[PDB]
Design a binder for this molecule. Structure first.
Ligand SMILES: Nc1ncnc2c1ncn2[C@@H]1O[C@H](COP(=O)(O)OP(=O)(O)OP(=O)(O)O)[C@@H](O)[C@H]1O
Ligand SMILES: Nc1ncnc2c1ncn2[C@@H]1O[C@H](COP(=O)(O)OP(=O)(O)OP(=O)(O)O)[C@@H](O)[C@H]1O
Ligand SMILES: [Mg+2]
Ligand SMILES: [Mg+2]
Lengths: 100, 406, 597, 406, 307
């Protein structure tokens, strides 16, 4: 499908962002998240991977890039650190696309 | 030199055409086949190009329509109509533009046509026509998608050859369209995804930062090209290109970085250097909220440390001015004596300034229902941003900093 | 006609071209007593009411002059900066006009202010209100409408274009009448837009503030409150306007109509306790005037004394016997001599002379009463402890209800007055002697040359003499008006009807009607089960609806296959929700007792 | 006349990106900065100095889309050289291409500065992506500048946009503030004297204020008081310590009154002129006493007891976790029960009493929550402080503090 | 019982008939006083226990005959101050046009009464305290009307908390004189019987009942319904192609942050089936409607009034 190959041809930090979303959803057991918990997991994943420390205005750029397409639908950017982030595609599809 | 600046500034600032295409040959072969199919024969077609922002969808249609226009006995008979979502928001304005670009504003006269399709039928009856619909999803949010339905219905049914190309950056573009217009839509999708690795990114770097072969000052041109070869093979240039590659694989950001590094070049300093790309990468990677919190007064920083303790103790619970003022009072007694011992109105003025910058947000939005105090608000700074900003806060009194650690 | 599935029925007298309507006089006379009397009383009413209205509107113009002098001084000071000025970051001059709590009389207070400005500072003064400016577009639309009236996507540049068209020098003055009610957004946007372009559009704002000036802080933030140069102003007090209008309407002898003590208590209570609105007092006086000239036929004699006696001279027989059966005249003949008893009743020509004599006696009683009242107020205000009252109207009420020296209150003011300093007494008799100066045509000139003699003396024996002088004066001339014959011609005493028309209590009426149906239905309906259905249901609920239904069924069957009693329960419960007693909840079929009384 | 100080790097970067007239610059630059950092001043002086055709538009004045477009197009038609009207964005683009083709404006970068641009995100949705892509849509060598106090990420539309170059105008430190405030020295007195005055003023007011305009205004106001010792002759130019000891207590009084705008500037300069000391003027504050009717007073001090006291305790106080959280809403029946309880005399439920209950709300002394079922209207709140109610209760001889809490 | 069955059982007669027959001519005596106080600049409000409709209608028959008078039904569910402005503007005055706003039409009619005094209008309101005329904007428009000298107004209030409607600014406009008329007639006209415990409910919901059921509900639920109200509004313009779909509704309501899961939307559409709000025509071969049966004009007038 379009969404799976779109996830596969995306950059490194967008894929790490989608992994933060998956792990945070596993922690929460819910389909929505405040952006704060996603960023707090994304910092830990960037530390584990070896990537440098991501600033808030880069993570917001990545999140708004994913929300500009429909891999993810989020609230207007007006509200910050207070967004509701939900996946638009199924979690198993995300794991299939990122496993490669 | 001035001419090098002029050519490369038209390459970077304006999105002016350059000759080569990076990894989009198959997609262009499909697109050019369908445009020559529409123009040469009488077949009517529809295409829905899908790709992220800055991935050259307009590059593909401009170069394809240019080579289509180059073909003999096509140029005299083919008419184009460029319509855009951000300009035309309602279908009557779209109708006005379709009359105006076809140069039939004199022909159409004062007659008011009974139905939209009758107006389009009169327009097209006075020779193929091509309809480039930029921002297709903005057309999709019309009242009942009337223009899209009429365009797809005329392309399917009428004899008059028509190509309807649409451009979107949404992967749910075939879920917004209502059930009749999907049925009228032939499902031809050309996906222009950025499928290129890091050595290909470095190749695009060196291809885009090089002069053309019709440049007059040839002797300067070859040494400029050898300089950009050495720059592309440099280590630190590779490091900043890797840092930009990890964020996105979009060529627009690369053209912004190259424009900044190009703009540093002056008459005295005539060749690019690794430090131009390093400093131009430093300019792009700034953190905005740290720059704002650097600008604050000392008292507003004391208020922010009080808010951070409030969110630390009573976790995920909103606050008003009275709790933050009480915690600040515990500060002005507990650490120091007769220093920072301000009255309530100046503290309220600082808190209202913090609200002006939108570093705090009113949780419930009403119309004058609440007074200035007792109004529940939330902090829009994470704890680690506050620690990083206090870390390099110019001359932050050891007292406030020691409060902040504990 | 009025019952159809639509909500507007308009009846016109069309196809019948007789549009002549009844003159208002025809509505005044609904009876057959005396129509010429009932048409002349309506002219007398209109005359007296126009006089009181004109006197009040002149008085309010006179009172607030002092505030306008300072305010015109401030607006003459402020515009000198524009005369020098090249904005140089000049602020917008504003005046916070702290008005009172009352809202009704403010429409007078601004209007005179408007005229004052149009005479002195500017010819361009416009007033805006919060009710008709919801957003910036409507705000600027009405701004450029009133500015163009004083002399299409309107913008501030279009205002400056009009200004440079008309001037080719004075400021423009915007009065915000109701500061409390404005939206916050239009105030901040108007201040920020106007502040940038004031160097070609001079702007002076007056804020009409009902409460304390802290409201300026509440609506306007500190980033916007620093763009104004603010100066505070305080207006009249409501109490002072009340005492002034009472002194110039009731206590003056110029107007023939008066009001009783209980009517005055009602109008003073609905002011002091509920709202400090003098315009409601003027409404109450107009209503008392209308009921007094509508009820009493012989109130045609309530005029100025020349017209009063020429109206006495020509009367009908029925008006003469109405005079003959007045209770004040009926007790007057009883204390009169035995020959004069038959002399008054048998002959109408003797009666026409006697009523003229009695009315002239009543008028000079009023003149003496009010003059001695002002002098007693001078003694009352001079004393520190303020026993009878602080003001003129409290003293007038307490003397009007009963004799002061009959009450034991007056011994206290005597004993406080008797021990006093010489200089204080010199000031007191100076004040009293300029009261005797103040009212000409005195019938107490002997007291005027007496108080000239005691002032000319200027110890404790003559202090006792002057205190006994005012003591004999206050026994002599202040008496309640009920002890004067023919007093019901110029007095109105209907307290309860006035109280019901002005200050109603529509909850007490419903509660009394439901708890006691016997007051309005005197057919033996209650002493401490036979009632209208609404009463029957109302008594029972004071709450599940089926138990209430069977209780109502039991009661009404005790009162007498019946399906109708359940239908009566449906109607009764439905019409109880229209009066606000039943509210549907979810715990039971229903459970609510929101009346709670 | 027009000097820019401590902004050398920032004006260098703008002059670099503008480049030459024939060259094409960025379609949009987004300048953001903390308050009083010289955004408007530096940009206006730079644009006026280089003699570039440019338009300055404030978005606060243009609360309508038509007003904004009309203002831009009319100012450009005056720069070219009666009245042109444009309702929609498309008509703006057509007429913009029409006015741009004048001989003076064919080949030069035309700037459209948009100051206070955070009010562009509350207007029509197509306006802000339309302006960011104006060089792409119109193709007329146009550059737009957005000046704002708000960081860029808040502006981002949901569907994305042509991302601009984000620039940061940094704050002034203590040295930059001192060498911008002392620059306009008074001609009568010594420059070092005025510099020491700026040194003590910045020494007092740095903690609560880092705004250039407010500090410049406070330096203007307090300067005749500073030089009164040298005028009286008790101290000289070089007796710095005596002057600082004189003005050091007065600066605190100027911080607590003028800085909060309690006492206006004219009354303040009158106080220094006529030698009347400050502290004898009440100011706009401390006038918190309003003369109210008797029943409205008791309604107000009954609604304050209804709002700020729990319903569970209502039995104990009247029939026989703090104030910090705020006012709790109450129903109207509680207001009538408390009102009937506290008043010693009999109260009848007349029309005037309900008119008073619905009047306090209009006078912003009370406030209804819900805004639903106005006739029933049970919900109400109390918006006044402890001191106002305590004063009113003292007037009618009622002990409010016994009833508030144990 | 039924509301129609309530209409059929009208057999009952009042017990105290002769006793209540003297309470009508007693109030009929005061008619000349009421008319005179109308001409002198006062207005009359009637407060009582029974229905004042018959008294006001007798007042129309006896006195206000040779005048251009207007009768207004507050008790009618489909009434608004916009309608009374139209009724003043189009037939009483000979204007035939459309006005931009209610305030712009109110200022036109106010100005029309300013330049001419030959017009006199009598404006009766049978209930001034009904739900449609409860708004502060509504009473502000009526207060702007009644304060002129060429127009007169008699109104009656029934609710126990009617004095909350008027404050000191608004009761300055109305020169009220409060007259008690405590007749004992039953509320046969003003009791609609709709949303009562009579189980029978007739036709589409009136706007008052639609608002009353919709206010005591989750704000997210008000949004979810507004979506279909606005959709059905833009779809109903021709009878062709009418009908929403449930997967399409899940798409539209997931785009917005209203519903989290499909089971939540199913639970929501059953809650709308509970109050007879939604008509589920799912399983229809053409399209799975999920439409609303409420009239379209009522839906527009609800959405404009909702906030
Ligand atoms: N694969 C590619 N081949 C050639 N040029 C490219 C490619 N990808 C990006 N570019 C360059 O990057 C820019 C892409 O932006 P362009 O205006 O062509 O379309 P776009 O921005 O994707 O369209 P939209 O604005 O609708 O997103 C152009 O300057 C183009 O020259
Ligand atoms: N270097 C300087 N030299 C002299 N004056 C300066 C300097 N910098 C700023 N100013 C003053 O600052 C004012 C302009 O400040 P500006 O409006 O740019 O602040 P701002 O941050 O835009 O404010 P806001 O927060 O209202 O947007 C001018 O009046 C100017 O006199
Ligand atoms: Mg494009
Ligand atoms: Mg500025």
């Amino acid at each position: 499908s379009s969404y799976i190959t779109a996830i596969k041809n995306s950059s490194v930090l967008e894929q790490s962002f989608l992994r933060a979303i998956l792990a945070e959803f596993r922690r929460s057991g819910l389909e929505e998240a405040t952006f704060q918990q996603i960023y707090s997991q994304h910092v830990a994943l960037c530390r584990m991977e070896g990537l440098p420390y991501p600033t808030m205005s880069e993570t917001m750029a990545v999140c708004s890039h994913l929300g500009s397409c429909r891999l993810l639908l989020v609230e207007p950017s007006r509200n910050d650190l207070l967004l509701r982030v939900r996946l638009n595609v199924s979690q198993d599809d995300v794991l299939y696309a990122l496993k490669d | 030199l001035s001419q090098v600046q002029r050519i490369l500034r038209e390459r970077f600032c304006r999105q002016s055409p350059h000759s080569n295409l990076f990894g989009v040959q198959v997609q262009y072969k499909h697109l050019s086949e369908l445009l020559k199919r529409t123009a040469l024969h009488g077949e009517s077609n529809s295409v829905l190009i899908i790709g992220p922002r800055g991935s050259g969808k307009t590059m593909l249609i401009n170069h394809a329509l240019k080579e289509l226009m180059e073909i003999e006995e096509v140029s005299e008979n083919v008419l184009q109509v460029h319509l855009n979502g951000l300009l035309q928001i309602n279908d009557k304005i779209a109708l006005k533009e379709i009359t105006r670009q076809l140069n039939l504003e004199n022909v159409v006269g004062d007659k008011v046509f009974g139905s939209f399709a009758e107006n389009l039928s009169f327009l097209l009856e006075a020779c193929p026509v091509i309809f480039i619909l930029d921002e297709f999803d903005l057309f999709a949010h019309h009242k009942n998608q009337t223009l899209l339905y009429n365009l797809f219905d005329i392309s399917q049914s009428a004899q008059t050859p028509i190509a309807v190309i649409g451009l979107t950056c949404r992967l749910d573009i075939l879920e917004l369209l209502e059930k009749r217009v999907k049925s009228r839509f032939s499902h031809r999708q050309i996906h222009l995804m950025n499928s290129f690795g890091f050595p290909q990114y470095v190749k695009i770097f060196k291809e885009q930062l090089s002069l053309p072969a019709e440049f007059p000052d040839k002797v300067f041109a070859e040494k400029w090209n050898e300089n950009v070869q050495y720059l592309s093979e440099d280590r630190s240039v590779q490091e900043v290109l890797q840092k930009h590659f990890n964020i996105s694989k979009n060529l627009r950001s690369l053209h912004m970085l190259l424009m900044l590094a190009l703009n540093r070049v002056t008459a005295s300093h005539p060749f690019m250097t690794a430090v131009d790309l390093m400093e131009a990468s430093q300019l792009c990677s700034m953190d905005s909220k740290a720059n704002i919190v650097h600008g604050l007064s000392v008292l507003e920083i004391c208020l922010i440390i009080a808010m951070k303790h409030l969110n630390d103790i009573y976790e995920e619970e909103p606050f008003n001015f009275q709790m933050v003022y009480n915690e600040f009072q515990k500060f002005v007694q507990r650490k120091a004596h007769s220093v920072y011992n301000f009255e309530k109105p100046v503290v309220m003025k600082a808190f209202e300034h913090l609200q002006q910058l939108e570093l705090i947000k009113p949780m419930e939005r009403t119309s004058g229902n609440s007074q200035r105090e007792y109004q529940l608000m939330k902090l829009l700074l994470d704890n680690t941003q506050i620690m990083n900003a206090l870390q390099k806060y110019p001359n932050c009194p050891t007292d406030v900093r020691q409060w902040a650690t504990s | 006609t009025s019952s159809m599935s639509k909500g507007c029925f308009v009846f016109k007298p069309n196809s019948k071209k007789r549009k002549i309507s009844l003159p208002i006089e025809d509505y005044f006379n609904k009876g057959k007593n005396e129509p010429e009397d009932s048409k002349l009383r309506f002219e007398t009413y209109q005359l007296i009411w126009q006089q009181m209205k004109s006197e009040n509107e002149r008085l309010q113009e006179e009172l607030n002059k002092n505030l306008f002098d300072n305010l015109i001084e401030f607006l003459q000071k402020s515009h000198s900066g524009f005369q020098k000025n090249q904005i140089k970051l000049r602020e917008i001059p504003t005046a916070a006009l702290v008005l009172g709590v009352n809202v009704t009389d403010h429409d007078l207070t601004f209007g005179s202010l408007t005229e004052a400005l149009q005479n002195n500072v500017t010819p361009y003064v416009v007033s805006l209100q919060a009710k008709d400016c919801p957003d910036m577009k409507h705000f600027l639309q009405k701004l450029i409408s009133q500015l163009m009236d004083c002399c299409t996507h309107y913008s501030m540049d279009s205002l400056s274009s009009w200004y440079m068209t008309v001037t080719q020098s004075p400021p423009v003055v915007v009065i915000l009448k109701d500061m409390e009610s404005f939206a916050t957004k239009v105030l901040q946007d108007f201040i920020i837009i106007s502040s940038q372009h004031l160097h070609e559009f001079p702007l002076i704002l007056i804020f009409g503030i009902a409460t304390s000036p802290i409201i300026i802080h509440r609506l306007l933030p500190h980033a916007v409150s620093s763009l104004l140069c603010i100066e505070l102003f305080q207006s009249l007090s409501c109490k002072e306007h009340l005492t002034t209008v009472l002194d110039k309407l009731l206590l003056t002898t110029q107007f023939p109509f008066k009001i009783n003590e209980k009517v005055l208590q009602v109008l003073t209570n609905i002011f002091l306790y509920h709202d400090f609105s003098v315009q409601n007092f003027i409404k109450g006086l107009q209503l008392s005037l209308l009921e007094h000239f509508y009820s009493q036929p012989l109130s045609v004699l309530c005029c100025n004394l020349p017209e009063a006696k020429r109206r006495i001279n020509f009367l009908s027989n029925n008006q003469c016997e109405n005079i003959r059966r007045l209770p004040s005249f009926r007790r007057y003949v009883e204390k009169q001599a035995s020959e004069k008893q038959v002399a008054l009743l048998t002959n109408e020509r003797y009666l026409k002379e006697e009523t003229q004599l009695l009315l002239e006696n009543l008028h000079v009683y009023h003149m003496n009463y009010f003059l001695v009242l002002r002098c007693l107020h001078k003694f009352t205000s001079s004393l520190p402890k303020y026993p009878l009252g602080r003001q003129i109207r409290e003293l007038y009420c307490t003397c009007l209800e009963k004799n002061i020296w009959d009450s034991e209150e007056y011994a206290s003011v005597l004993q406080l007055l008797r021990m006093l300093a010489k200089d204080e007494l010199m000031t007191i008799l100076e004040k009293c002697f300029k009261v005797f100066k103040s009212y000409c045509e005195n019938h107490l000139g002997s007291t005027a040359k007496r108080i000239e003699e005691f002032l000319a003396q200027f110890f404790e024996v003559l202090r006792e003499n002057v205190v006994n002088f005012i003591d004999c004066l206050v026994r002599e001339y202040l008496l309640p008006p009920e002890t004067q014959p023919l007093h019901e011609v110029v007095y109105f005493s209907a307290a309860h009807a006035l109280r019901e028309h002005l200050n109603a209590a529509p909850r007490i009426a419903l509660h009394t009607a439901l708890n006691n149906p016997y007051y309005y239905l005197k057919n033996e309906a209650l002493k401490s089960n036979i009632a209208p259905d609404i009463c029957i249901a109302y008594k029972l609920h004071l709450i599940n609806l089926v138990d209430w239904s069977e209780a109502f069924a039991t009661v009404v069957t005790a009162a007498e296959m019946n399906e109708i009693i359940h239908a009566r329960f449906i109607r009764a419960v439905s019409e109880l929700e229209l009066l606000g007693f039943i509210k549907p909840t979810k715990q039971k079929t229903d459970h609510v007792a929101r009346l709670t009384w | 006349e027009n000097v820019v100080l401590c902004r050398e790097s920032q004006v260098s970067i703008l002059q670099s990106l503008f480049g030459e007239r024939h060259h094409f610059s960025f379609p949009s630059i987004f300048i953001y900065g903390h308050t009083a950092s010289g955004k408007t001043y530096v940009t206006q002086t730079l644009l006026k100095t280089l003699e570039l055709p440019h338009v300055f538009v404030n978005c606060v004045e243009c609360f309508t889309l038509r007003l904004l477009l009309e203002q831009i197009l009319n100012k450009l038609n005056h720069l070219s050289s009666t009245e042109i009207t444009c309702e929609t964005f498309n008509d703006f683009v057509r007429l913009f291409k029409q006015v741009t083709t004048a001989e003076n404006l064919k080949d030069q970068t035309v700037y459209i500065v948009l100051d206070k641009a955070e009010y562009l995100r509350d207007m029509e949705a197509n306006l802000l992506p339309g302006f960011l892509r104006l060089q792409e849509l119109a193709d007329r060598n146009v550059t737009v500048l957005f000046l704002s106090e708000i960081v860029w990420e808040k502006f981002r539309p949901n569907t994305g946009c042509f991302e601009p170059f984000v620039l940061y105008f940094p704050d002034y430190s203590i040295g930059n503030l001192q060498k911008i405030l002392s620059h306009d020295h008074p001609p009568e007195y010594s420059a070092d004297f005025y510099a020491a005055y700026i040194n003590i003023l910045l020494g007092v007011f740095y903690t609560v204020c880092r705004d250039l305009k407010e500090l410049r205004h406070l330096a203007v106001l307090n300067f005749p008081k500073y030089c009164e010792p040298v005028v009286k002759g008790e101290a000289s130019e070089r007796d710095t310590r005596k002057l600082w000891r004189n003005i050091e207590p007065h600066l605190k009084k100027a911080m607590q009154t003028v800085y909060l705008r309690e006492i206006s500037s004219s009354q303040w300069e009158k106080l220094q002129k006529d030698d009347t000391d400050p502290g004898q003027l009440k100011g706009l504050s401390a006038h918190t006493h309003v003369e109210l009717p008797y029943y409205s007073k008791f309604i107000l001090i009954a609604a304050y007891l209804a709002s700020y006291n729990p319903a569970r305790t209502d039995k104990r106080f009247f029939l026989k976790s703090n104030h910090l959280l705020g006012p709790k809403p109450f129903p109207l029946d509680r207001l009538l029960a408390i009102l009937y309880s506290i008043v010693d005399s009999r109260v009848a439920p007349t029309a005037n009493i309900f008119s008073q209950i619905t009047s306090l709300v209009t006078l912003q002394l009370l406030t209804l929550v819900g805004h639903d079922d106005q006739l029933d209207g049970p919900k109400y709140k109390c918006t006044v402080s402890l001191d106002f109610i305590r004063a009113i209760a003292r007037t009618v001889n009622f002990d409010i503090i016994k009833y508030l809490y144990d | 019982d039924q509301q129609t069955l309530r209409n059929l059982l009208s057999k009952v007669s009042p017990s105290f008939s002769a006793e209540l027959k003297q309470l009508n001519q007693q109030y009929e005596k005061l008619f000349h006083k009421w008319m005179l106080q109308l001409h002198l600049g006062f207005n009359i409000v009637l407060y009582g226990l029974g229905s004042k409709r018959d008294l006001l209608e007798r007042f129309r028959t006896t006195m206000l005959q040779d005048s251009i008078h207007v009768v207004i039904n507050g008790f009618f569910p489909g009434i608004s101050v916009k309608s009374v402005l139209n009724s003043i503007t189009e037939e009483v005055l000979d204007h035939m046009g459309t006005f931009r706003s209610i305030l712009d039409q109110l200022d036109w009619i106010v100005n029309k009464f300013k330049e001419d005094s030959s017009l006199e209008l009598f404006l009766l309101i049978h209930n001034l305290d009904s739900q449609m005329l409860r708004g502060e904007k509504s009473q502000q428009i009526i207060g702007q009307l009644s304060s002129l000298h060429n127009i007169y107004l008699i109104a009656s209030i029934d609710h126990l908390n009617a004095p909350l409607m008027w404050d000191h600014a608004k009761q300055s406009l109305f020169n009220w004189l409060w007259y008690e008329t405590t007749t004992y007639s039953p509320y046969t006209e003003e009791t609609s019987y709709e949303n009562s415990l009579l189980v029978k409910q007739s036709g589409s919901l009136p706007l008052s009942s639609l608002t009353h059921v919709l206010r005591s509900l989750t704000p997210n639920a008000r949004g979810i319904f507004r979506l279909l109200i606005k959709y059905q509004l833009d779809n109903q313009d021709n009878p062709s192609y009418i009908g929403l779909s449930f997967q399409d509704f899940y798409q539209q309501c997931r785009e917005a942050f209203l519903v989290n899961s499909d089971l939540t939307l199913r639970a929501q559409l059953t809650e709308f089936r509970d109050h007879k709000l939604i008509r589920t025509k799912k399983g229809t071969d053409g399209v799975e409607y999920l439409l609303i049966p409420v009239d379209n004009g009522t839906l527009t007038d609800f959405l404009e009034k909702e906030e």
